[PDB]
PDB file of C-alpha atoms and ligand atoms in Angstrom:
ATOM      1  CA  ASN A  27      31.504  38.358  15.478  1.00  0.00           C
ATOM      2  CA  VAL A  28      29.419  36.065  13.243  1.00  0.00           C
ATOM      3  CA  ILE A  29      27.951  32.652  13.913  1.00  0.00           C
ATOM      4  CA  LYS A  30      29.937  30.470  11.495  1.00  0.00           C
ATOM      5  CA  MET A  31      27.582  27.512  10.985  1.00  0.00           C
ATOM      6  CA  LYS A  32      27.510  23.999   9.451  1.00  0.00           C
ATOM      7  CA  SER A  33      24.861  22.221   7.333  1.00  0.00           C
ATOM      8  CA  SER A  34      24.892  19.482   9.985  1.00  0.00           C
ATOM      9  CA  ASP A  35      23.054  22.013  12.180  1.00  0.00           C
ATOM     10  CA  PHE A  36      20.136  21.912   9.728  1.00  0.00           C
ATOM     11  CA  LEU A  37      17.554  19.135   9.322  1.00  0.00           C
ATOM     12  CA  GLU A  38      16.945  20.295   5.808  1.00  0.00           C
ATOM     13  CA  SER A  39      15.374  21.762   2.940  1.00  0.00           C
ATOM     14  CA  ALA A  40      12.087  23.043   1.545  1.00  0.00           C
ATOM     15  CA  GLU A  41      13.332  25.197  -1.361  1.00  0.00           C
ATOM     16  CA  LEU A  42      10.811  28.062  -1.605  1.00  0.00           C
ATOM     17  CA  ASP A  43      10.113  30.540  -4.419  1.00  0.00           C
ATOM     18  CA  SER A  44      11.724  33.831  -3.339  1.00  0.00           C
ATOM     19  CA  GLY A  45       9.808  36.349  -5.494  1.00  0.00           C
ATOM     20  CA  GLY A  46      12.130  36.569  -8.526  1.00  0.00           C
ATOM     21  CA  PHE A  47      15.508  36.220  -6.749  1.00  0.00           C
ATOM     22  CA  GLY A  48      15.972  32.585  -7.746  1.00  0.00           C
ATOM     23  CA  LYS A  49      15.887  29.771  -5.200  1.00  0.00           C
ATOM     24  CA  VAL A  50      16.418  30.054  -1.462  1.00  0.00           C
ATOM     25  CA  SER A  51      15.741  27.401   1.203  1.00  0.00           C
ATOM     26  CA  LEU A  52      13.607  27.174   4.363  1.00  0.00           C
ATOM     27  CA  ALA A  53      15.801  24.986   6.580  1.00  0.00           C
ATOM     28  CA  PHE A  54      15.318  23.854  10.161  1.00  0.00           C
ATOM     29  CA  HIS A  55      18.141  24.638  12.604  1.00  0.00           C
ATOM     30  CA  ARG A  56      18.210  21.692  15.012  1.00  0.00           C
ATOM     31  CA  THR A  57      18.546  24.043  18.046  1.00  0.00           C
ATOM     32  CA  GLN A  58      17.291  27.479  16.917  1.00  0.00           C
ATOM     33  CA  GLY A  59      14.318  26.753  14.653  1.00  0.00           C
ATOM     34  CA  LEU A  60      13.405  28.033  11.201  1.00  0.00           C
ATOM     35  CA  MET A  61      15.730  30.061   8.999  1.00  0.00           C
ATOM     36  CA  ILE A  62      16.278  30.897   5.341  1.00  0.00           C
ATOM     37  CA  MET A  63      19.375  29.934   3.295  1.00  0.00           C
ATOM     38  CA  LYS A  64      20.890  31.567   0.202  1.00  0.00           C
ATOM     39  CA  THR A  65      23.549  29.142  -1.085  1.00  0.00           C
ATOM     40  CA  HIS A  75      38.613  34.202  -1.091  1.00  0.00           C
ATOM     41  CA  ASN A  76      37.247  32.567   2.094  1.00  0.00           C
ATOM     42  CA  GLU A  77      38.498  35.411   4.320  1.00  0.00           C
ATOM     43  CA  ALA A  78      37.133  38.154   2.036  1.00  0.00           C
ATOM     44  CA  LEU A  79      33.650  36.590   2.274  1.00  0.00           C
ATOM     45  CA  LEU A  80      33.849  36.174   6.089  1.00  0.00           C
ATOM     46  CA  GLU A  81      35.088  39.776   6.396  1.00  0.00           C
ATOM     47  CA  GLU A  82      31.936  40.897   4.599  1.00  0.00           C
ATOM     48  CA  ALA A  83      29.640  38.501   6.482  1.00  0.00           C
ATOM     49  CA  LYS A  84      30.922  40.171   9.683  1.00  0.00           C
ATOM     50  CA  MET A  85      30.187  43.635   8.233  1.00  0.00           C
ATOM     51  CA  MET A  86      26.549  42.777   7.436  1.00  0.00           C
ATOM     52  CA  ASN A  87      25.884  40.806  10.614  1.00  0.00           C
ATOM     53  CA  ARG A  88      26.318  44.088  12.514  1.00  0.00           C
ATOM     54  CA  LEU A  89      23.037  45.205  10.826  1.00  0.00           C
ATOM     55  CA  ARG A  90      20.756  45.005  13.849  1.00  0.00           C
ATOM     56  CA  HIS A  91      17.288  46.643  13.840  1.00  0.00           C
ATOM     57  CA  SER A  92      13.712  45.388  14.165  1.00  0.00           C
ATOM     58  CA  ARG A  93      12.850  46.459  10.565  1.00  0.00           C
ATOM     59  CA  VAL A  94      15.928  44.835   8.947  1.00  0.00           C
ATOM     60  CA  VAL A  95      16.329  41.091   8.227  1.00  0.00           C
ATOM     61  CA  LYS A  96      19.338  39.880  10.299  1.00  0.00           C
ATOM     62  CA  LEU A  97      22.166  37.795   8.934  1.00  0.00           C
ATOM     63  CA  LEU A  98      22.206  35.004  11.543  1.00  0.00           C
ATOM     64  CA  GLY A  99      25.400  33.411  10.208  1.00  0.00           C
ATOM     65  CA  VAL A 100      27.163  31.649   7.311  1.00  0.00           C
ATOM     66  CA  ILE A 101      27.800  28.141   6.001  1.00  0.00           C
ATOM     67  CA  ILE A 102      31.164  28.245   4.207  1.00  0.00           C
ATOM     68  CA  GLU A 103      32.024  24.612   3.449  1.00  0.00           C
ATOM     69  CA  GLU A 104      33.646  22.991   0.406  1.00  0.00           C
ATOM     70  CA  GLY A 105      31.291  23.653  -2.510  1.00  0.00           C
ATOM     71  CA  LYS A 106      28.508  25.407  -0.586  1.00  0.00           C
ATOM     72  CA  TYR A 107      28.625  29.034   0.513  1.00  0.00           C
ATOM     73  CA  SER A 108      25.372  29.981   2.272  1.00  0.00           C
ATOM     74  CA  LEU A 109      24.088  33.053   4.125  1.00  0.00           C
ATOM     75  CA  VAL A 110      21.593  32.343   6.913  1.00  0.00           C
ATOM     76  CA  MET A 111      18.837  34.813   7.735  1.00  0.00           C
ATOM     77  CA  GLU A 112      15.689  35.120   9.818  1.00  0.00           C
ATOM     78  CA  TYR A 113      12.441  33.881   8.299  1.00  0.00           C
ATOM     79  CA  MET A 114       9.350  36.035   7.657  1.00  0.00           C
ATOM     80  CA  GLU A 115       6.261  33.852   7.468  1.00  0.00           C
ATOM     81  CA  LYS A 116       3.949  35.765   5.128  1.00  0.00           C
ATOM     82  CA  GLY A 117       6.505  36.567   2.349  1.00  0.00           C
ATOM     83  CA  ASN A 118       7.069  39.822   0.463  1.00  0.00           C
ATOM     84  CA  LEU A 119       4.951  42.961   0.635  1.00  0.00           C
ATOM     85  CA  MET A 120       3.470  42.524  -2.856  1.00  0.00           C
ATOM     86  CA  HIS A 121       2.151  39.023  -2.066  1.00  0.00           C
ATOM     87  CA  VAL A 122       0.356  40.149   1.128  1.00  0.00           C
ATOM     88  CA  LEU A 123      -1.236  43.162  -0.689  1.00  0.00           C
ATOM     89  CA  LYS A 124      -2.723  40.886  -3.395  1.00  0.00           C
ATOM     90  CA  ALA A 125      -4.193  38.701  -0.573  1.00  0.00           C
ATOM     91  CA  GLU A 126      -7.962  38.250  -0.445  1.00  0.00           C
ATOM     92  CA  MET A 127      -8.785  39.665   3.028  1.00  0.00           C
ATOM     93  CA  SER A 128      -7.154  42.986   2.128  1.00  0.00           C
ATOM     94  CA  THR A 129      -5.233  45.280   4.472  1.00  0.00           C
ATOM     95  CA  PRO A 130      -6.645  48.516   6.045  1.00  0.00           C
ATOM     96  CA  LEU A 131      -5.334  52.080   5.771  1.00  0.00           C
ATOM     97  CA  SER A 132      -3.870  52.281   9.293  1.00  0.00           C
ATOM     98  CA  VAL A 133      -1.822  49.115   8.726  1.00  0.00           C
ATOM     99  CA  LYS A 134      -0.499  50.502   5.428  1.00  0.00           C
ATOM    100  CA  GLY A 135       0.556  53.622   7.341  1.00  0.00           C
ATOM    101  CA  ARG A 136       2.489  51.458   9.799  1.00  0.00           C
ATOM    102  CA  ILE A 137       4.176  49.436   7.053  1.00  0.00           C
ATOM    103  CA  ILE A 138       5.249  52.746   5.492  1.00  0.00           C
ATOM    104  CA  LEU A 139       6.633  54.070   8.797  1.00  0.00           C
ATOM    105  CA  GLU A 140       8.488  50.803   9.476  1.00  0.00           C
ATOM    106  CA  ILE A 141       9.950  50.899   5.930  1.00  0.00           C
ATOM    107  CA  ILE A 142      11.148  54.456   6.744  1.00  0.00           C
ATOM    108  CA  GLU A 143      12.663  53.340  10.067  1.00  0.00           C
ATOM    109  CA  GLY A 144      14.523  50.371   8.516  1.00  0.00           C
ATOM    110  CA  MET A 145      15.869  52.516   5.654  1.00  0.00           C
ATOM    111  CA  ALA A 146      17.011  55.343   7.972  1.00  0.00           C
ATOM    112  CA  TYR A 147      18.913  52.771  10.020  1.00  0.00           C
ATOM    113  CA  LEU A 148      20.569  51.255   6.904  1.00  0.00           C
ATOM    114  CA  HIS A 149      21.713  54.698   5.731  1.00  0.00           C
ATOM    115  CA  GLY A 150      22.820  55.616   9.281  1.00  0.00           C
ATOM    116  CA  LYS A 151      25.223  52.625   9.102  1.00  0.00           C
ATOM    117  CA  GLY A 152      26.406  53.908   5.679  1.00  0.00           C
ATOM    118  CA  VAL A 153      24.638  51.088   3.758  1.00  0.00           C
ATOM    119  CA  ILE A 154      22.924  51.957   0.449  1.00  0.00           C
ATOM    120  CA  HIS A 155      20.415  49.308  -0.542  1.00  0.00           C
ATOM    121  CA  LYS A 156      20.389  50.161  -4.258  1.00  0.00           C
ATOM    122  CA  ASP A 157      17.486  47.741  -4.904  1.00  0.00           C
ATOM    123  CA  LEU A 158      14.524  48.550  -2.647  1.00  0.00           C
ATOM    124  CA  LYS A 159      11.227  47.156  -3.852  1.00  0.00           C
ATOM    125  CA  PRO A 160       8.165  45.148  -2.633  1.00  0.00           C
ATOM    126  CA  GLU A 161      10.147  41.896  -3.119  1.00  0.00           C
ATOM    127  CA  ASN A 162      12.780  43.057  -0.573  1.00  0.00           C
ATOM    128  CA  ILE A 163      10.082  44.039   1.961  1.00  0.00           C
ATOM    129  CA  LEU A 164       9.153  40.962   3.987  1.00  0.00           C
ATOM    130  CA  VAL A 165       6.192  40.431   6.345  1.00  0.00           C
ATOM    131  CA  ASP A 166       5.572  38.370   9.511  1.00  0.00           C
ATOM    132  CA  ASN A 167       2.297  37.034  11.037  1.00  0.00           C
ATOM    133  CA  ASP A 168       1.555  40.308  12.888  1.00  0.00           C
ATOM    134  CA  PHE A 169       1.959  42.334   9.610  1.00  0.00           C
ATOM    135  CA  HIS A 170       5.211  43.994  10.731  1.00  0.00           C
ATOM    136  CA  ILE A 171       7.856  44.284   8.040  1.00  0.00           C
ATOM    137  CA  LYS A 172      11.616  43.983   7.624  1.00  0.00           C
ATOM    138  CA  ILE A 173      13.887  45.187   4.844  1.00  0.00           C
ATOM    139  CA  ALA A 174      15.904  42.469   3.101  1.00  0.00           C
ATOM    140  CA  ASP A 175      18.515  42.364   0.293  1.00  0.00           C
ATOM    141  CA  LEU A 176      17.848  38.951  -1.313  1.00  0.00           C
ATOM    142  CA  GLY A 177      19.655  39.828  -4.574  1.00  0.00           C
ATOM    143  CA  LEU A 178      22.760  40.865  -2.602  1.00  0.00           C
ATOM    144  CA  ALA A 179      22.734  44.356  -4.138  1.00  0.00           C
ATOM    145  CA  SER A 180      24.564  45.775  -1.061  1.00  0.00           C
ATOM    146  CA  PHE A 181      27.333  43.143  -1.146  1.00  0.00           C
ATOM    147  CA  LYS A 182      30.518  42.889  -3.235  1.00  0.00           C
ATOM    148  CA  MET A 183      32.270  39.523  -2.738  1.00  0.00           C
ATOM    149  CA  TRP A 184      29.082  37.535  -2.044  1.00  0.00           C
ATOM    150  CA  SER A 185      27.398  39.114  -5.113  1.00  0.00           C
ATOM    151  CA  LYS A 186      30.241  38.031  -7.447  1.00  0.00           C
ATOM    152  CA  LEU A 187      29.338  34.480  -6.374  1.00  0.00           C
ATOM    153  CA  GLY A 207       9.591  44.518 -13.193  1.00  0.00           C
ATOM    154  CA  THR A 208      13.125  44.777 -11.782  1.00  0.00           C
ATOM    155  CA  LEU A 209      13.485  48.263 -13.254  1.00  0.00           C
ATOM    156  CA  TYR A 210      10.191  49.890 -12.132  1.00  0.00           C
ATOM    157  CA  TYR A 211      11.740  51.062  -8.793  1.00  0.00           C
ATOM    158  CA  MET A 212      15.102  52.190 -10.090  1.00  0.00           C
ATOM    159  CA  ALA A 213      15.948  55.896 -10.051  1.00  0.00           C
ATOM    160  CA  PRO A 214      16.211  57.504 -13.542  1.00  0.00           C
ATOM    161  CA  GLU A 215      19.871  58.457 -12.984  1.00  0.00           C
ATOM    162  CA  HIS A 216      20.608  54.680 -12.955  1.00  0.00           C
ATOM    163  CA  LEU A 217      18.410  53.849 -15.947  1.00  0.00           C
ATOM    164  CA  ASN A 218      20.807  53.559 -18.918  1.00  0.00           C
ATOM    165  CA  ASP A 219      23.795  54.650 -16.799  1.00  0.00           C
ATOM    166  CA  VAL A 220      25.414  51.866 -14.815  1.00  0.00           C
ATOM    167  CA  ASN A 221      28.613  53.823 -14.068  1.00  0.00           C
ATOM    168  CA  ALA A 222      26.932  56.507 -11.853  1.00  0.00           C
ATOM    169  CA  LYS A 223      27.340  55.600  -8.117  1.00  0.00           C
ATOM    170  CA  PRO A 224      24.092  55.042  -6.124  1.00  0.00           C
ATOM    171  CA  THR A 225      23.352  57.541  -3.333  1.00  0.00           C
ATOM    172  CA  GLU A 226      20.947  57.661  -0.372  1.00  0.00           C
ATOM    173  CA  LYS A 227      18.542  59.383  -2.782  1.00  0.00           C
ATOM    174  CA  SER A 228      18.580  56.368  -5.117  1.00  0.00           C
ATOM    175  CA  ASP A 229      16.788  54.579  -2.235  1.00  0.00           C
ATOM    176  CA  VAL A 230      14.328  57.482  -1.848  1.00  0.00           C
ATOM    177  CA  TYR A 231      13.117  57.122  -5.471  1.00  0.00           C
ATOM    178  CA  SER A 232      12.513  53.390  -4.916  1.00  0.00           C
ATOM    179  CA  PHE A 233      10.521  54.226  -1.777  1.00  0.00           C
ATOM    180  CA  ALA A 234       8.253  56.581  -3.779  1.00  0.00           C
ATOM    181  CA  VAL A 235       7.205  53.783  -6.155  1.00  0.00           C
ATOM    182  CA  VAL A 236       6.747  51.373  -3.219  1.00  0.00           C
ATOM    183  CA  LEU A 237       4.303  53.900  -1.731  1.00  0.00           C
ATOM    184  CA  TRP A 238       2.487  53.855  -5.036  1.00  0.00           C
ATOM    185  CA  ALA A 239       2.352  50.057  -5.129  1.00  0.00           C
ATOM    186  CA  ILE A 240       1.129  49.949  -1.510  1.00  0.00           C
ATOM    187  CA  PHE A 241      -2.062  51.842  -2.502  1.00  0.00           C
ATOM    188  CA  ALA A 242      -2.550  50.481  -6.051  1.00  0.00           C
ATOM    189  CA  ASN A 243      -2.097  46.882  -4.788  1.00  0.00           C
ATOM    190  CA  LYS A 244      -0.198  45.984  -7.989  1.00  0.00           C
ATOM    191  CA  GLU A 245       2.959  46.638 -10.048  1.00  0.00           C
ATOM    192  CA  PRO A 246       3.091  50.043 -11.874  1.00  0.00           C
ATOM    193  CA  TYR A 247       3.260  50.648 -15.633  1.00  0.00           C
ATOM    194  CA  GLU A 248       0.778  47.856 -16.550  1.00  0.00           C
ATOM    195  CA  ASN A 249       0.251  49.426 -20.037  1.00  0.00           C
ATOM    196  CA  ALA A 250       4.001  49.564 -20.904  1.00  0.00           C
ATOM    197  CA  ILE A 251       5.142  49.092 -24.545  1.00  0.00           C
ATOM    198  CA  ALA A 252       8.823  48.123 -24.430  1.00  0.00           C
ATOM    199  CA  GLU A 253      11.505  48.331 -21.736  1.00  0.00           C
ATOM    200  CA  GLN A 254      13.461  50.674 -24.037  1.00  0.00           C
ATOM    201  CA  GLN A 255      10.440  52.930 -24.526  1.00  0.00           C
ATOM    202  CA  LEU A 256       9.380  52.805 -20.864  1.00  0.00           C
ATOM    203  CA  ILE A 257      12.947  53.638 -19.689  1.00  0.00           C
ATOM    204  CA  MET A 258      13.131  56.672 -21.998  1.00  0.00           C
ATOM    205  CA  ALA A 259       9.707  57.752 -20.752  1.00  0.00           C
ATOM    206  CA  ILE A 260      10.809  57.417 -17.073  1.00  0.00           C
ATOM    207  CA  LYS A 261      14.102  59.247 -17.677  1.00  0.00           C
ATOM    208  CA  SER A 262      12.023  62.035 -19.282  1.00  0.00           C
ATOM    209  CA  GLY A 263       9.651  62.254 -16.255  1.00  0.00           C
ATOM    210  CA  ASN A 264       6.792  59.731 -16.508  1.00  0.00           C
ATOM    211  CA  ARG A 265       5.830  58.118 -13.210  1.00  0.00           C
ATOM    212  CA  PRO A 266       3.251  55.506 -12.110  1.00  0.00           C
ATOM    213  CA  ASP A 267      -0.341  56.536 -12.685  1.00  0.00           C
ATOM    214  CA  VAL A 268      -1.697  58.172  -9.501  1.00  0.00           C
ATOM    215  CA  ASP A 269      -5.211  57.497 -10.963  1.00  0.00           C
ATOM    216  CA  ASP A 270      -4.724  53.671 -10.738  1.00  0.00           C
ATOM    217  CA  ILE A 271      -5.367  54.252  -7.041  1.00  0.00           C
ATOM    218  CA  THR A 272      -8.919  52.817  -6.689  1.00  0.00           C
ATOM    219  CA  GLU A 273      -8.442  53.204  -2.920  1.00  0.00           C
ATOM    220  CA  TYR A 274      -8.408  56.262  -0.750  1.00  0.00           C
ATOM    221  CA  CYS A 275      -4.823  57.385  -0.466  1.00  0.00           C
ATOM    222  CA  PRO A 276      -4.404  60.531   1.712  1.00  0.00           C
ATOM    223  CA  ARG A 277      -3.263  63.533  -0.293  1.00  0.00           C
ATOM    224  CA  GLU A 278      -0.224  64.148   1.969  1.00  0.00           C
ATOM    225  CA  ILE A 279       1.088  60.701   0.967  1.00  0.00           C
ATOM    226  CA  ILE A 280       0.409  61.357  -2.728  1.00  0.00           C
ATOM    227  CA  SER A 281       2.459  64.527  -2.166  1.00  0.00           C
ATOM    228  CA  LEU A 282       5.278  62.564  -0.492  1.00  0.00           C
ATOM    229  CA  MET A 283       5.543  60.063  -3.336  1.00  0.00           C
ATOM    230  CA  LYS A 284       5.743  62.925  -5.888  1.00  0.00           C
ATOM    231  CA  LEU A 285       8.376  64.605  -3.736  1.00  0.00           C
ATOM    232  CA  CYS A 286      10.315  61.335  -3.491  1.00  0.00           C
ATOM    233  CA  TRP A 287      10.238  60.524  -7.259  1.00  0.00           C
ATOM    234  CA  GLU A 288      11.553  63.914  -8.375  1.00  0.00           C
ATOM    235  CA  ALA A 289      13.883  63.460 -11.379  1.00  0.00           C
ATOM    236  CA  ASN A 290      16.537  65.683  -9.734  1.00  0.00           C
ATOM    237  CA  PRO A 291      18.111  63.660  -6.847  1.00  0.00           C
ATOM    238  CA  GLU A 292      18.876  66.829  -4.889  1.00  0.00           C
ATOM    239  CA  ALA A 293      15.165  67.720  -4.730  1.00  0.00           C
ATOM    240  CA  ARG A 294      14.337  64.425  -2.919  1.00  0.00           C
ATOM    241  CA  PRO A 295      14.387  64.327   0.932  1.00  0.00           C
ATOM    242  CA  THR A 296      16.452  62.054   3.149  1.00  0.00           C
ATOM    243  CA  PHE A 297      14.755  59.187   4.996  1.00  0.00           C
ATOM    244  CA  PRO A 298      15.128  61.111   8.324  1.00  0.00           C
ATOM    245  CA  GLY A 299      13.531  64.088   6.526  1.00  0.00           C
ATOM    246  CA  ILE A 300      10.628  61.852   5.443  1.00  0.00           C
ATOM    247  CA  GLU A 301      10.257  60.345   8.927  1.00  0.00           C
ATOM    248  CA  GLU A 302      10.195  63.697  10.772  1.00  0.00           C
ATOM    249  CA  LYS A 303       7.202  64.743   8.599  1.00  0.00           C
ATOM    250  CA  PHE A 304       5.459  61.341   8.243  1.00  0.00           C
ATOM    251  CA  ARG A 305       5.566  60.050  11.831  1.00  0.00           C
ATOM    252  CA  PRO A 306       3.455  62.924  13.351  1.00  0.00           C
ATOM    253  CA  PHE A 307       1.195  62.685  10.323  1.00  0.00           C
ATOM    254  CA  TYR A 308       0.790  58.960  10.916  1.00  0.00           C
ATOM    255  CA  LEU A 309       0.000  59.042  14.616  1.00  0.00           C
ATOM    256  CA  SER A 310      -2.302  62.088  14.407  1.00  0.00           C
ATOM    257  CA  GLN A 311      -4.346  60.885  11.355  1.00  0.00           C
ATOM    258  CA  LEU A 312      -3.761  57.077  11.173  1.00  0.00           C
ATOM    259  CA  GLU A 313      -3.053  55.992  14.779  1.00  0.00           C
TER     260      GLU A 313
HETATM  261  C1  LIG B   1       3.910  30.767  -5.573  1.00  0.00           C
HETATM  262  C2  LIG B   1       3.108  30.917  -4.292  1.00  0.00           C
HETATM  263  O1  LIG B   1       1.987  30.441  -4.252  1.00  0.00           O
HETATM  264  N1  LIG B   1       3.603  31.560  -3.192  1.00  0.00           N
HETATM  265  C3  LIG B   1       4.915  32.205  -3.049  1.00  0.00           C
HETATM  266  C4  LIG B   1       4.590  33.546  -2.345  1.00  0.00           C
HETATM  267  C5  LIG B   1       3.322  33.239  -1.471  1.00  0.00           C
HETATM  268  C6  LIG B   1       3.654  33.486   0.025  1.00  0.00           C
HETATM  269  N2  LIG B   1       3.444  32.434   1.046  1.00  0.00           N
HETATM  270  C7  LIG B   1       2.214  32.439   1.862  1.00  0.00           C
HETATM  271  S1  LIG B   1       4.609  31.271   1.329  1.00  0.00           S
HETATM  272  O2  LIG B   1       5.009  30.623   0.114  1.00  0.00           O
HETATM  273  O3  LIG B   1       4.163  30.545   2.471  1.00  0.00           O
HETATM  274  C8  LIG B   1       6.144  32.056   1.689  1.00  0.00           C
HETATM  275  C9  LIG B   1       7.083  32.060   0.682  1.00  0.00           C
HETATM  276  C10 LIG B   1       8.318  32.648   0.871  1.00  0.00           C
HETATM  277  C11 LIG B   1       8.605  33.258   2.094  1.00  0.00           C
HETATM  278  C12 LIG B   1       9.933  33.874   2.279  1.00  0.00           C
HETATM  279  C13 LIG B   1      10.801  33.952   1.171  1.00  0.00           C
HETATM  280  C14 LIG B   1      12.042  34.505   1.246  1.00  0.00           C
HETATM  281  C15 LIG B   1      12.463  34.995   2.508  1.00  0.00           C
HETATM  282  C16 LIG B   1      13.751  35.560   2.681  1.00  0.00           C
HETATM  283  C17 LIG B   1      14.129  36.022   3.928  1.00  0.00           C
HETATM  284  C18 LIG B   1      13.219  35.931   4.986  1.00  0.00           C
HETATM  285  N3  LIG B   1      12.017  35.407   4.817  1.00  0.00           N
HETATM  286  C19 LIG B   1      11.596  34.928   3.629  1.00  0.00           C
HETATM  287  C20 LIG B   1      10.307  34.364   3.512  1.00  0.00           C
HETATM  288  C21 LIG B   1       7.647  33.252   3.109  1.00  0.00           C
HETATM  289  C22 LIG B   1       6.421  32.643   2.910  1.00  0.00           C
HETATM  290  C23 LIG B   1       2.922  31.783  -1.889  1.00  0.00           C
HETATM  291  C1  RCM B   2      20.782  38.788   2.262  1.00  0.00           C
HETATM  292  N1  RCM B   2      20.514  39.405   3.573  1.00  0.00           N
HETATM  293  C2  RCM B   2      19.364  39.977   4.001  1.00  0.00           C
HETATM  294  O1  RCM B   2      18.339  40.039   3.368  1.00  0.00           O
HETATM  295  N2  RCM B   2      19.433  40.487   5.239  1.00  0.00           N
HETATM  296  C3  RCM B   2      20.776  40.179   5.719  1.00  0.00           C
HETATM  297  C4  RCM B   2      21.529  41.370   6.234  1.00  0.00           C
HETATM  298  C5  RCM B   2      21.598  42.440   5.195  1.00  0.00           C
HETATM  299  C6  RCM B   2      22.633  42.710   4.360  1.00  0.00           C
HETATM  300  N3  RCM B   2      22.359  43.809   3.587  1.00  0.00           N
HETATM  301  C7  RCM B   2      21.097  44.261   3.928  1.00  0.00           C
HETATM  302  C8  RCM B   2      20.326  45.294   3.474  1.00  0.00           C
HETATM  303 CL1  RCM B   2      21.009  46.287   2.287  1.00  0.00          CL
HETATM  304  C9  RCM B   2      19.094  45.566   3.986  1.00  0.00           C
HETATM  305  C10 RCM B   2      18.584  44.732   4.963  1.00  0.00           C
HETATM  306  C11 RCM B   2      19.311  43.689   5.429  1.00  0.00           C
HETATM  307  C12 RCM B   2      20.568  43.446   4.930  1.00  0.00           C
HETATM  308  C13 RCM B   2      21.441  39.487   4.548  1.00  0.00           C
HETATM  309  O2  RCM B   2      22.556  39.029   4.521  1.00  0.00           O
END
């Protein structure tokens, strides 16, 4: 069961920039502290109850909902340092062992989501949020995984089977492709395809088998992680592993080489 909330429980607002997902709001619960707010009543609630069951340390929790006349808001836990891309482009830059942990925690969170039959469909640095200790949580701030709540750069992480084909149904392996490009971004410390001509041209190129430039990596990236990204951004969805497949290989690798 969901905490159904009221806006009289919130002191109020400090609308923050949410990384390309439009406006959100950092609002102060009068009893339970800081929270974030994204602003058919039984269909909504039914869904809100579905998503509120999503409970894992690497997944942003839906705390509850503000369904009042005019305003429909979802209420979620706050992550102080923002999205993964922002923290990477930060001046005091982040070491290799911490990047390894972020990767493993992204794997854990995604495995959980799948295990509860949720397909994210829109994984990307913007939906990977960070707290003060540099642990991460997966979010869905564009409501990609929703149906009724949805009704009420983007493309760089999308699997080629979805580029120019919006009728094909996302699979677990759609999320694996997005992971591959996140891996890339984690070591390049920027967005891929800097030199792109047009979206139309770039899309064709990606559907035909172009990927981010593994040479833009001015850091040391271990060669077993460059292998994993190439595995995970295979054109053919069937040739990509599952997140449990990735974890089983990457966790022993992490602890034994990255600690
Ligand atoms: C334009 C600019 O100069 N900047 C925006 C990004 C850069 C990062 N900052 C240090 S921050 O502004 O303090 C910050 C912003 C947004 C968030 C956030 C957003 C959306 C969230 C959804 C769910 C959970 N937590 C969230 C948390 C958390 C922290 C500062
Ligand atoms: C918008 N929103 C989140 O970011 N986290 C919560 C819970 C949630 C719903 N769908 C999710 C996906 Cl696909 C991943 C992580 C959290 C979630 C929520 O409602």
